[PDB]
Design a binder for this molecule. Structure first.
Ligand SMILES: *[C@@H]1O[C@H](CO)[C@@H](O)[C@H](O)[C@H]1NC(C)=O
Ligand SMILES: *[C@@H]1O[C@H](CO)[C@@H](O)[C@H](O)[C@H]1NC(C)=O
Ligand SMILES: *[C@@H]1O[C@H](CO)[C@@H](O)[C@H](O)[C@H]1NC(C)=O
Ligand SMILES: *[C@@H]1O[C@H](CO)[C@@H](O)[C@H](O)[C@H]1NC(C)=O
Ligand SMILES: *[C@@H]1O[C@H](CO)[C@@H](O)[C@H](O)[C@H]1NC(C)=O
Ligand SMILES: *[C@@H]1O[C@H](CO)[C@@H](O)[C@H](O)[C@H]1NC(C)=O
Ligand SMILES: *[C@@H]1O[C@H](CO)[C@@H](O)[C@H](O)[C@H]1NC(C)=O
Ligand SMILES: *[C@@H]1O[C@H](CO)[C@@H](O)[C@H](O)[C@H]1NC(C)=O
Lengths: 366, 224, 346, 50, 198
């Protein structure tokens, strides 16, 4: 830590000691059902874009690796979470949004996006956690004579808020004379068809889009990845895993009075202080394992290779590895004498260390 | 129905998150009812729909089951899906359909293609009941509290934080508001939410016991 | 605002004004000497026992080595300031068991041997007036382990790698140096500050001091009881002003308040995102794969490093100010206590 | 700019401590002028004879 | 005419505060110190002002420096003439030479230049596509403008950090000089000093 080979007389702050964890804890709620991703990705027909349907998924074990076997897609396009870590962590609800669009407007399904579908049919929020799966469906969603079972909306009087449906069919008016249910001058029908044909280009093919909207750990978790729970051990330095969040620390019994809608406790540095066990209704503190600073008291290397070690701010019972307890921690390797000399190496609150002849050894004194 | 105007008296503070904080001062920015606001008092002895202006604070100091249910929407006479909450002594039914609301919708003590239907535990249980309705990002959030009340003339003095009760993925357009009355004399307070910044105090037991505005008076800006 | 009372001195070319009596006045000057010595662990602050954050932090070179060097230099400089102010007398003098000094009562400034920490009455008033932050110079990990009431500010300070080191000289040693200086000043005079202590009666010492200011020494020998009574009344007034007024010691309380506020700001800075998706490092590591978590972790690392550098820079500036104040206090100990000063308003 | 203020809120309390440092300097300037010039207790006057 | 630098400083959030003591009160304090020194001597710095003729006060000042007081009483007219000529020479050197007051001018110039640099730092891109925030808002979508605005925010915060640190160091220097000026007021004006070259 000095980046040299010969050190001088003094006290040097070298490093920090920490207690390493011995075990590992995984705690997930006991759910046995399987999430029905198989019936979402296959259907005879999906819904139209203006009347997109949303399926709620909850209280089941979700395996996200079987989604690839259900549809031939490339773009597993995700924003706030990686596609490869969806089994290691858990949510409170999953919402699957199903519709069939044109291939040219797949890029409009993104947070902070505008256009026609993104403004008048299906709008995504700015803080969107969750992700999009889109695949080509020219085999099932096309006809040589044209496909007129899929509708979209041209324009609206105002923009459309995120996660909102408007299925009502009223004739638009852009003037003073009322339409009165007649599509005459300045009056148009709002919904018109894609009109799919197999002879269209690659940008005008039908695309099937499923949007999985994930809401994070603000509630008791219901949708969980496939992982095995472990027995809970307390008063030990472990590596816990409570509903997808990792960490290292010591779990103890808690006296905090959680309200029944609360399951997490947070400290002023926005770190987790208390947790609720997902299996049994139990509140546990999270206190980090033992740590501190280590100072090395030495004479010169041309005098001796003997050193003393000061563990700062801790008792000698707390340290894992002549022992004297000062007010600056406690000191191992130097004996305490009932004599008083002038200060040679300053240790702490009125204690100094020296290399004396009473064989030469390192002594500590007031 | 009879109208009166009264002061809010630092009511309408709710928990903004499901996170336990103890003995701390926390600053949040959300749709809150401002302190000492001008809320309105309705005596329904008799009725168009009330506006839903970026959230609604609702208060009722009566008893029994004379008050139940709400209607949210933007064109309640069909041709648009609307949100309906109906209460009883056992069950809460929450439905999002097109419906056929009349000019005076009410429930007798003695409807189209739709998706969302919900069955839940009763929302309802000297008894002042406070509700906060919010509609953010396609989610309808309902907070509530029940407290003992001494005088029924005005809203009480002090703080009573509103715990979060139901979050729903409704996803409709809500502009107007209607209250259902059970018919075999009911008075209620209505106020409107505004996007303000609050400074809240969590005591040693994790309960919000005090809160300060940030644009009421210059002393509140100084405390911010 | 009013600048002061309006006065019109009567000047004539043949008129003079000469005083006929005097007052003996005891005033109080308060000077800061040292401040809190702190040490910061970078790995526990920026990363918090995360391996990936430490591996990305190793690519930033030697920022944390030189921040640790600056904090160690400040901590050594504080003990140097205390040593140059207080540890100035060569020998530990003692007052005689007889307590007659010409009628001058030094009972409230001499130490009392009943208490273990042998401090005087005025020193006890000064210690009880300035409340302390109860910093990390007393060990608290056993107390931070036992979850009593709520989580403290000091426990959350030390859990994130911020530690307070104890000073080298305890308060007993500072009180012993003060008692040695007081005993030497009362018994010998100014002779102990320029060689060996030569004893002299206290009345003859005060006659020497009046001869230093231009007053003939028979004035003391004729008004000794009046001067001793005025000194005793002024000491009692100083005691009553310390017992009643608590705002006179605002400089040392300001030092304590600044040193606590900077550490509280350093702890509260850990909740910021700095453009990342989260402030919690484990949420970023669990939710995202390697490249994207590397980007977010780098953003958090840059923000925490900038905040820690800001803390170290303001600590260096405050250390320079405290060193200037300690040099002034050492000069005042040398020239007011160990001698008699002819400098006006010094 | 509202979006800039929303993105600036994620940087914590840098603005507060910059404001605190500048306020400390501003108070210190007045303290400097007070400790140099305001040393006399009363406002003395020179007589009209010169 | 054209836009001033002061308006450009004020339109970007930088404000100059007025001092608590106006120049009239500083001149009143200086006048009180001069009147007390001229009439009383050093007696007004230790309590109540005690009048004395100025010739006898100057004889006290001569006895302070080791010269016997009859020298002034025998050369009073010559001493008064030499003092009047020296005051007139101070008058002429202040009327002619303009470079004597360079320290206070440098104090003014540094504080002007720091604010001018802080205003001029607003035209930098810091790696973004534009220094204008509204052009970044109008020319990009949410994520790209968030990246560019984050770059501009870090650059402007770093420049303002540099300004505040320079101001703190200069404030320390000014406080040291003010402490020296207060000591010289208490010792040279309110008394006679025996310290050499002080
Ligand atoms: C799609 O899922 C259904 C389940 O409803 C299943 O019967 C069918 O075989 C699946 N088809 C393909 C091609 O995977
Ligand atoms: C999960 O474990 C708890 C604790 O024993 C138990 O009460 C609960 O019934 C379990 N749930 C299931 C679905 O097995
Ligand atoms: C820590 O050391 C102190 C001082 O010797 C002692 O009073 C205390 O009991 C110790 N803590 C333990 C042994 O847990
Ligand atoms: C609330 O608004 C009504 C509307 O006229 C007004 O009469 C009343 O004074 C207001 N209450 C206040 C300002 O407290
Ligand atoms: C939706 O609500 C908004 C209020 O924000 C209103 O302006 C608009 O007209 C509503 N749209 C419909 C179709 O009712
Ligand atoms: C917190 O709860 C305890 C329960 O014993 C109670 O004694 C204490 O007064 C409460 N604190 C409050 C109400 O501030
Ligand atoms: C001295 O003062 C008196 C009046 O105060 C004045 O008449 C006289 O001229 C003065 N002496 C001289 C030499 O001017
Ligand atoms: C000195 O003062 C103390 C308290 O101020 C008093 O108790 C004591 O009697 C005094 N000494 C003498 C000799 O009177």
């Amino acid at each position: 830590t000095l980046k040299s080979f010969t050190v001088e007389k003094g006290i040097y702050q070298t490093s920090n000691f920490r207690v390493q964890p011995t075990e590992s804890i995984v705690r997930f709620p006991n759910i046995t059902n399987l999430c029905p991703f198989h019936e979402v990705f296959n259907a005879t027909t999906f819904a139209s874009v203006y009347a997109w349907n949303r399926k709620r998924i909850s209280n089941c074990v979700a395996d996200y690796s079987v989604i690839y076997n259900f549809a031939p897609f490339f773009a597993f396009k995700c924003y706030g979470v990686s596609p490869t870590k969806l089994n290691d962590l858990c949510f409170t609800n999953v919402y699957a949004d199903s519709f069939v669009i044109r291939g040219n407007e797949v890029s409009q399904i993104a947070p902070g996006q505008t256009g026609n579908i993104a403004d008048y049919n299906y709008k995504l929020p700015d803080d969107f956690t969750g992700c999009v799966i889109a695949w080509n469906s020219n085999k099932l969603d096309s006809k040589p004579s044209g496909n007129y079972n899929y509708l979209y909306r041209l324009l609206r009087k105002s923009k459309l808020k995120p996660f909102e449906r408007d299925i009502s069919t009223e004739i638009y008016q852009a003037g003073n004379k009322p339409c009165n249910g007649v599509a005459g001058p300045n009056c148009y029908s709002p919904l018109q068809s894609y009109g799919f044909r197999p002879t269209y280009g690659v940008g005008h093919q039908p695309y099937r889009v499923v949007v999985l909207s994930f809401e994070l750990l603000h509630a008791p978790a219901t949708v969980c990845g496939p992982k095995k729970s472990t027995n809970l051990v307390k008063n030990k330095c472990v590596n816990f895993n409570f509903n997808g969040l990792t960490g290292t620390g010591v779990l103890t019994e808690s006296n905090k009075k959680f309200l029944p809608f609360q399951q997490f406790g947070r400290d002023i540095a926005d770190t987790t202080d208390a947790v609720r066990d997902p299996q049994t209704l139990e509140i546990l503190d999270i206190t980090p394992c033992s740590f501190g600073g280590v100072s090395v008291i030495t004479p010169g290397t041309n005098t001796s290779n003997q050193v003393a070690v000061l563990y700062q701010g801790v008792n000698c019972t707390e340290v894992p590895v002549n022992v004297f307890q000062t007010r600056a921690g406690c000191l191992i390797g130097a004996e305490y004498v009932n004599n008083s000399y002038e200060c040679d190496i300053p240790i702490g609150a009125g204690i100094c260390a020296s290399y004396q002849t009473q064989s030469q050894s390192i002594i500590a004194y007031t | 129905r009879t109208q009166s105007y009264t002061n809010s008296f630092t009511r309408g503070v709710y928990y903004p998150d499901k996170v336990f904080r103890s003995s701390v001062l926390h600053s949040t920015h959300d749709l809150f009812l401002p302190f000492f606001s001008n809320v309105t008092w309705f005596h329904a002895i008799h009725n168009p729909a009330l506006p839903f202006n970026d959230g609604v604070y609702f208060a009722s100091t009566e008893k029994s089951n004379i008050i139940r249910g709400w209607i949210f929407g933007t064109t309640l006479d069909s041709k648009t899906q609307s949100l309906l909450i109906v209460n009883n002594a056992t069950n809460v039914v929450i439905k999002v359909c097109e419906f056929q609301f009349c000019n005076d919708p009410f429930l007798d003590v003695y409807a189209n293609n739709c998706t969302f239907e919900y069955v839940s535990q009763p929302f309802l249980m000297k008894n002042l009941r406070e509700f906060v309705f919010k509609n953010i990002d396609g989610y309808f959030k309902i907070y509530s509290k029940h407290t003992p009340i001494n005088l029924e003339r005005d809203l009480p003095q002090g703080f009573s934080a509103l715990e979060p009760l139901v979050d729903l993925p409704i996803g409709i357009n809500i502009t107007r508001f209607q209250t259902l009355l059970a018919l075999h004399a009911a008075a209620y307070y209505v106020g409107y939410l505004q996007p303000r910044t609050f400074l809240l105090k969590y005591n040693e037991n994790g309960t919000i016991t005090d809160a300060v505005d940030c644009a009421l008076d210059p002393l509140s800006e100084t405390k911010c | 605002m009013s600048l002061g009372a309006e006065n019109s001195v009567a000047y004539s070319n043949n008129s003079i004004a000469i005083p006929t009596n005097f007052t003996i006045s005891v005033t109080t000057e308060i000077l800061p000497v040292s401040m809190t010595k702190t040490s910061v662990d970078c790995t526990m602050y920026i990363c918090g026992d995360s391996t990936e954050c430490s591996n990305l932090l190793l690519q930033y070179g030697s920022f944390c080595t030189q921040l640790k060097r600056a904090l160690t230099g400040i901590a050594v400089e504080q003990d140097k300031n205390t040593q140059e102010v207080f540890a100035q007398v060569k020998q530990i003098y003692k007052t005689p068991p007889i307590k007659y000094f010409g009628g001058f009562n030094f009972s409230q400034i001499l130490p009392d041997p009943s208490k273990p920490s042998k401090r005087s009455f005025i020193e006890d008033l000064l210690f009880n007036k300035v409340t302390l932050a109860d910093a990390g110079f007393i060990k608290q990990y056993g107390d931070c382990l036992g979850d009593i009431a709520a989580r403290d500010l000091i426990c959350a300070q030390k859990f994130n790698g911020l530690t307070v080191l104890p000073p080298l000289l305890t308060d007993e040693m500072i009180a012993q140096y003060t008692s040695a200086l007081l005993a030497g000043t009362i018994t010998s005079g100014w002779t102990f500050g320029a060689g060996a202590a030569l004893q002299i009666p206290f009345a003859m010492q005060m006659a020497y001091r009046f001869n230093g200011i231009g007053v003939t020494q028979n004035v003391l020998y004729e008004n000794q009881k009046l001067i001793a009574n005025q000194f005793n009344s002024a000491i009692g007034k100083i005691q009553d002003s310390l017992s009643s007024t608590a705002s006179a010691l605002g400089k040392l309380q300001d030092v304590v308040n600044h040193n606590a506020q900077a550490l509280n700001t350093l702890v509260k800075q850990l909740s910021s995102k700095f453009g990342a998706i989260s402030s919690v490092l484990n949420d970023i590591l669990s939710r995202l794969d390697k490249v994207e978590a590397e980007v977010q972790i780098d953003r958090l690392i840059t923000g925490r490093l900038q905040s820690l550098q800001t803390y170290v820079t303001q600590q260096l500036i405050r250390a320079a100010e405290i060193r200037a104040s300690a040099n002034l206090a050492a000069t005042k100990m040398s020239e007011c206590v160990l001698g008699q000063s002819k400098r006006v308003d010094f």
